[PDB]
Symmetry: D3
Subunit: 233 residues, 6 copies
């Protein structure tokens, strides 16, 4: 009766934090709460290094931190397909990849994300307009956020999003958590504690290997983010 859903979260996870994990908890409670869906699985998909984002450390490490973070998760797992791509892959292709994989009574894959990601649809050249359309019309978004009217507004201001609003589920986050990866790296560079902001095993892995520093933050400096490069050219 209810539609089975698989939550897919793409992102750089640089590094993964408690907020990324909360995203799944919140979305699951929300989708299951509607009485219309059954969340069967969650997937964390770290982006490959060809994404070229500034300060992005090696994919293998981000994949290991995510596995450590979901070690004790009964329903959330890590998928490495994206991390292994020599050519950065569009989110639309990742969704397609996962939907097809499930096909091989079939659960539907929905993109799990936050407000920022939804709003980035308006950054020039970051997304191919046709991609935005197929993502909302054929897959769906589960957008979690502390600024719900911020997202509702953004959806209202765009004809394509408004038209497919039935597939964009905005999930309010009442507990104010804004544990960004960027503030974690900043904390690490300064020798500050990040305990209780990221799983214990992740924090331990990061400190053991000094993964984050001024130097790592410099990776890809002056380089153009893959999507931008490819959509402008």
């Amino acid at each position: 009766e209810k539609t089975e859903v698989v939550l897919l979260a793409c992102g750089s996870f640089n590094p993964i934090t408690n907020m990324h994990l909360r995203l799944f908890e919140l979305a699951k409670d929300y989708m299951n709460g509607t009485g219309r869906y059954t969340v069967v699985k969650g997937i964390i998909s770290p982006v490959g290094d060809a994404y070229k984002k500034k300060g992005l450390i090696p994919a293998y490490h981000r994949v290991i931190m995510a596995e450590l973070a979901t070690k004790n998760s009964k329903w959330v797992e890590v998928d490495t397909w994206e991390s292994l791509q020599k050519e950065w892959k569009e989110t639309l292709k990742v969704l397609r990849h996962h939907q097809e994989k499930l096909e091989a009574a079939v659960p539907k894959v929905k993109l799990l994300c936050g407000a920022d990601l939804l709003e980035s649809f308006a950054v020039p050249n970051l997304w191919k307009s046709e991609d935005i359309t197929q993502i909302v019309a054929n897959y769906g978004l589960i957008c979690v956020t502390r600024a719900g009217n911020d997202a509702q507004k953004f959806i209202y201001e765009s004809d394509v999003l408004w038209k497919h609003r039935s597939n964009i589920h905005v999930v309010n986050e009442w507990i104010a958590n804004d544990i960004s990866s960027t503030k974690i790296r900043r904390a690490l560079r300064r020798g500050q504690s990040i305990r209780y902001l990221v799983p214990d095993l992740v924090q331990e892995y990061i400190e053991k290997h000094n993964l984050y520093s001024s130097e790592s933050e410099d990776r890809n400096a002056g380089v153009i983010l893959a999507p931008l490069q490819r959509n402008t050219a």
Copy 2:
């Protein structure tokens, strides 16, 4: 050279969450960061049932969760003295109890709190005025908050806090993660997940004893908060 410091936090811890542990980490980085102090220990002291606060579940439950929460901490521990007293004890007595206990070169106990508690100083009949003075003049306050200017202002607006401002340290939390006990109890009453908001051992203990509910929320309904009863009469 450096003044050694023991950070003490009184509160209901109903229940303890990642945020209370996070307060300790933050306060310690800040105090050690000044170069003028060395934080040798943190103490979590749950309030005894005589506090009579609404929704306050039994102290043994709150103490065990706080103990489970700090089990894997190397410097934060729980002290049960206050929870075991038959009569509710003023924060100043708790600070004094602990300061004396250390005398037996001697570390200074300092109160660790959020802006809310600092602000509660103005609540009529909540604090004896000589208490506030002794606390800030003889012990000290380490006030952690996301609303820095709020606290700075509160201090600026009181002749006494301002006079002793050198003994009051406002610590800014740039990684906003406000996991209140109230929001946790609300989530629990609603069957929502609190995974990653509190230590796994705390969650497991909450689950096993089905701790928070509409009925628990009702405890002490209509009773008058202990310090209010005492200071009024």
Copy 3:
């Protein structure tokens, strides 16, 4: 397939304005837009004089203004049942009266209101707690507003509303209005035009009978609102 719905707006309509009529258009588009409902009728039900609200003019006139306002509406009508009650009737009973009437495959009546009304649920004694419960659980509320996180938040802070959140639909209204009856009456007493804020026929009816003045505003001065008097005593 789709659930048929009848929207019922209770209120003083003192006087009815363009925003009251907008409520129906918005709600209808929203409900039919979900693809899960079919709005078959709108009902404006002006409150009887026994409600005793300060400044409330005779019900006969409020009913006439509502009739004139919906003269050209194909689906929104006026029901006088409430206006004729010698004893003020609780909204729950009005809802019940209309649902029973429909039972003579049966459409469901839902209360159409704005966020102000939803929030009035917290005014001490204004609403019987069990009434609120039965309204959200057995009928439903379609709440329109320019402050949706206003309403969303109000629902999140109440266990009973949250529990029945599936029966409460928040409809964002992006075209920022704010045309309260109270400001229309203030305008009239000041001899200001209210054309284009209310239907032409309503404006003309008001002008012809000098309905609103300082005298009309004093009606019921010093009298307690019916629900308050009945729930307190």
Copy 4:
């Protein structure tokens, strides 16, 4: 004794809405209210197609809607001069034309506008600086807005406007209902009701001719707004 005044509003009126008409009502109450003026007429002057604004439908439709909107008004009418010119006309010329036309103890024509228009004086190349000076110095400006202190600040920040401020009247709208033309088109594209947001005859005219759509919104896409083209090149 009292200076007679003719309020003139230039604009695209694409489409006209209840808000554009309320604007005249408010300004009239204000100007007459001061005891120093007598408003004898209001003129809506739709901009011609040569303005080249994106999404601007043909002037005949906009003029007709505007006439339908004012058919039932006793003092506000539509003037077509501006729209009949082959070349887009500077607002100052439109004002001059009308002042001259009245000289055929003579009423003063004053520009009637919202805050948006006022603030557009800062847009690079949108207005020749001598035009601004002449408009405010020789005719006058009646600025109706819900952001009164906003308009006041904009005037304070400009030497030109401040110097002639006695000829600028900021009228506060306390009964806000910002029904922008942009939001009306947005609603039309989406099949949403606009009943009670525009005069019934406008609404019916739009509906009979299916006026707004994705296609109309594209008109002049990529074409440079006439004033910009003129004052730049």
Copy 5:
């Protein structure tokens, strides 16, 4: 062109650059409409009978006001209200000054939005006093929160009805040197140089006028207006 006399009542406990600033702002504004001509400014310190918490001796407040205006061509201090052994309503102070001028310029009350909004504080003003002040004299209300004052006026049928006699003067230079904050600064021994005129600063320092003790004067005592009007 109507001649206007700006009358400012209040504690001036102590007078600050902001109070003086009020006159300059109002003058430029009224004179700027072309419909008026400001001829004089009168600072009138309230008498000690007002009984407001922290109010120091009128002798000092009068003296500081005089020092503040010593070099003022058009603003002066009127010690009448101060020498009143019985606290006088603002209306009566306006009358006193109107009647004094006829022995003809119109006296208008100069003030801030606080004072205007205080019309809503229970029993602080006799409603007929409000009506007569706005109706028969006029308010020149200076403020940084202009919409604060406009909304307050819009919300009251009485003030609205007399809106033409209530001139709201915006002040765009965000400065709010309240007396309260000057006292606070002095109790804590911080400098207030450049927030009040040099002579008032020097006067205050030389006599250690403000303190925890001076702040406690009249503690627990009801405000004159509140007493008279409630009983």
Copy 6:
């Protein structure tokens, strides 16, 4: 207890009660920490080579600064910077004054508002090595009403955060925003600026009719010296 000298660089166009208030606030703060003793305050107006739009002749600015502090027991004016032919970096001004004191030696600290601090992010306005040296070897006493604005600006910058022990954020609780810009605007419109600046500065401006639409246009279109030098 470390002896300190507060040095304020800026256009001072014109100086107002607020710039003066800035010194009083910082000195009270610094002395109140019980770790410092503020011995002197120096106001140093930028030279005309700054080329900032609306910047009137440096000589007038210096004189108003002198009149403003004529009665100041501890704050004085220094024309060295205004007399240089080429616009001088703040780092060089600080250095020049620290070297002048060396002739138990007092430390010169830059006194500024949040704007200047935040200006560190303006592209090409400051050499990054210059920022590091100013904060590491001299220090910043930043006065402001938006304390969290500044605290946050510091928190977001690794170099500033790193040297935060040398950056003191002093909260101004008595809002006192008398910007030079608003003073010039008021004067152009003939409004009174009495009690916004010291009486003597006010009298001087009046006597010389200093600010006008015309002066406000000085250097119109000219690129600010730092931006010019750092882009080339």
